[PDB]
Write a protein that binds this DNA or RNA. Structure first.
Length: 294
RNA sequence: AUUGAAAGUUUUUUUUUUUUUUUUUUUUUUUUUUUUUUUUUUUUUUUU
C-alpha cells in the first residue's frame, strides 16, 4: 500500500546531538521515525497500539536511494545513468557460473563512472537505454532558541529540513485509514509546520528469491536469527539506532550495525522468522530498475 | 507513543545636537479746472 505526505514544510530528521546543538544527518526520513509518528497518532486517537505494523522509509517524491549499478557519469557531478531493465539484464547469469568481478563491469564507455551507494536520486528522462538521473538536494535551516525563566541562562539550536511531497509503503491496515496527519521530528510539540498523510492506490510487490534491492537498511541475521543468506552483497555498512518490542521487559534502543540503504544483495533463500519490517529494516524487493516507483 | 525530552534569540539603548529664507528694491514719469454769457429792459421829481 502506498501513502502520500504533502509536507511542503520544514521538519527535522536524524539528529546528532553536539554539546547542546542538534544537526541534520539523514537527508531522507527513516522508517523508524515515521513508524513512531504514525503509531503515536494511533495512540493519541485510541491508545491501542500494534507492533505488526511496518512502513517503508519515506523519500522525496520521484526520488530513491542509489545502488552500485546506478553510478554518476562524473566523478564530481550529480548526473546518474543506468541501463533499462538492468537487473533483468544483470542477475540472470548469477544462476550460471559467471565471475562476479566480470559481472560488475561499469566501463560501458571510456572514463567509466564511480558510484555512490545510498544517495537520493531523482529520475530525469529516457535518453535511450541509459536513463537520466539527478542527485536530490534539500533545503535546510538553523533555528536557535534562548532559555529564560526576561533573562537568558542557556542556549539551544536546531536544524530543520524542507521537503516536498513524500511517498512511502506501509502495511495494509485500518491504521492509515483512521490516521490523517502525523507530528514528525525531534521536537514534536515544538517546531512542526505542516504534516498530513494521504492514502493512495494499493501496492502489490513480491518478495522472493533472486537479486533484490534492499530499500531499508537490511540485515542478514541478528542474535543468530538467520533471516536470509546472500551469494554476493554490494553496498555499505550502516549503524542502526531504533526501537523494537520483544513483548516482555526492555525493548528499546537496540543498536546493531547493518547494511546501508540501497545496497544490492543477491539472496537465494529466506527464513520464516519474525520479520524485521516492523523494526524498520529488511524492505527489499525485486525491481526491473529505479522506475519501479511507477 | 519518532533514539527523545524541554527550553521566547530574549533581554537593555529616544536618530539626537549645530542653522533667523536672509541682504539689497521710494507705485513714480508726464497733463494750467478752462471755454463761450454787457447785471440788462420798463418809470417825465413830481398837483387843489
Amino acid at each position: 500500500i502506498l501513502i502520500k505526505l504533502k509536507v511542503k514544510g520544514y521538519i527535522t530528521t536524524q539528529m546528532r546531538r553536539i554539546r547542546n546543538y542538534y544537526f541534520s544527518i539523514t537527508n531522507y526520513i527513516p522508517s523508524t521515525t515515521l513508524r513512531g509518528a504514525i503509531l503515536a497518532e494511533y495512540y493519541n486517537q485510541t491508545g491501542k497500539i500494534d507492533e505488526n505494523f511496518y512502513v517503508s522509509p519515506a523519500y522525496p517524491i520521484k526520488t530513491a536511494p542509489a545502488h552500485y549499478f546506478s553510478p554518476a557519469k562524473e566523478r564530481k557531478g550529480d548526473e546518474f545513468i543506468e541501463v533499462k531493465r538492468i537487473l533483468e539484464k544483470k542477475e540472470k547469469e548469477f544462476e550460471a557460473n559467471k565471475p562476479i568481478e566480470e559481472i560488475m563491469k561499469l566501463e560501458i564507455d571510456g572514463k567509466h563512472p564511480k558510484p555512490k551507494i545510498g544517495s537520493l536520486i531523482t529520475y530525469e528522462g529516457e535518453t535511450d537505454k541509459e536513463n537520466k538521473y539527478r542527485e536530490f538536494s534539500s533545503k535546510s535551516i538553523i533555528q536557535m532558541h534562548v532559555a529564560i525563566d526576561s533573562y537568558k541562562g542557556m542556549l539551544f539550536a536546531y536544524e530543520y529540513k524542507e521537503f516536498d511531497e513524500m511517498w512511502a509503503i506501509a502495511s495494509d491496515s485500518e491504521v492509515i485509514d483512521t490516521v490523517k496527519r502525523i507530528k514528525i521530528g525531534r521536537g514534536k510539540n515544538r517546531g512542526n509546520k505542516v504534516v498530513d498523510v494521504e492514502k493512495v492506490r494499493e501496492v502489490s510487490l513480491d518478495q522472493s528469491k533472486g537479486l533484490l534491492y534492499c530499500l531499508s537498511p537490511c540485515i542478514g541475521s541478528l542474535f543468530g536469527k538467520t533471516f536470509f543468506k546472500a551469494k554476493y552483497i554490494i553496498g555499505d555498512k550502516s549503524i542502526y539506532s531504533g526501537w523494537f518490542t520483544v513483548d516482555s521487559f526492555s525493548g528499546q534502543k537496540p543498536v546493531f550495525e547493518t547494511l546501508r540503504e540501497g545496497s544490492l544483495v543477491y539472496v537465494e533463500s529466506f527464513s520464516n522468522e519474525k520479520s524485521l519490517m516492523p523494526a524498520g529494516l529488511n524492505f527489499m524487493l525485486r525491481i526491473s530498475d529505479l522506475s519501479s516507483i511507477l
